RNA sequence: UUCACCUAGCCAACACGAUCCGGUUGUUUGGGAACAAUUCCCUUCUAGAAGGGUAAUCUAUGUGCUAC
């Protein structure tokens, strides 16, 4: 687990680093956010996403991790290239350069609560 | 492909694998139950006749009875 202090430069290692994404969406969505979740999953597979994501009617956040260069494209896609209406984009934290990764597969957390408890809640 | 999340609610006979045990550890030829009164008649033989017995209990599935 050698840090970037060993010899990363602009020759060949400039595109050999990992990190975490930074995004926090907020605003109303069509139906219950089904369109946004489906669109994000298809694009995420092409970029070989590892982290997870959360989608809902209003709340939309998550933690996405991957390559330093791969995540750069997603920043522009999820800021202007949005078919739905977006109010504003927030940020929580970011970090570039880290040995190995935490997650292994891309998945979206969905509300699988039973319908019986929905009325009580 | 809810690869997710707790398990006093799993197989060692699909397979890998911690420890004990080591059956020339394989092969040739066979078997692996529920149903006995023998070809019964001095009337008959190269064109049809007389006798066949374990009645012990459950679960899951096809199939039947309806008008005086």
TrEMBL record:
Keyword set for this entry?
A: Coiled coil
Q: Ranges for the Acylphosphatase-like domain? A: 20-110
This protein's name: Acylphosphatase-like domain-containing protein
Organism field? Toxoplasma gondii (strain ATCC 50611 / Me49)
């Amino acid at each position: 687990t050698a840090p970037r202090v060993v010899r990363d430069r602009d020759e060949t290692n400039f595109h050999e680093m990992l990190g975490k994404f930074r995004f926090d969406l907020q605003g109303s969505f069509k139906e219950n956010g089904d369109m946004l979740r489906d669109s994000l999953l298809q694009v995420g597979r092409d970029l070989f996403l590892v982290g997870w994501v959360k989608c809902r009617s209003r709340f939309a956040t998550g933690h996405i991790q991957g390559d330093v260069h791969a995540l750069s494209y997603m920043r522009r896609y999820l800021e202007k290239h949005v078919d739905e209406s977006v109010s504003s984009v927030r940020f929580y934290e970011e970090n570039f350069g880290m040995p190995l990764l935490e997650y292994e597969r891309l998945s979206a957390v969905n509300d699988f609560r039973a319908p019986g408890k929905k009325q009580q809640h």
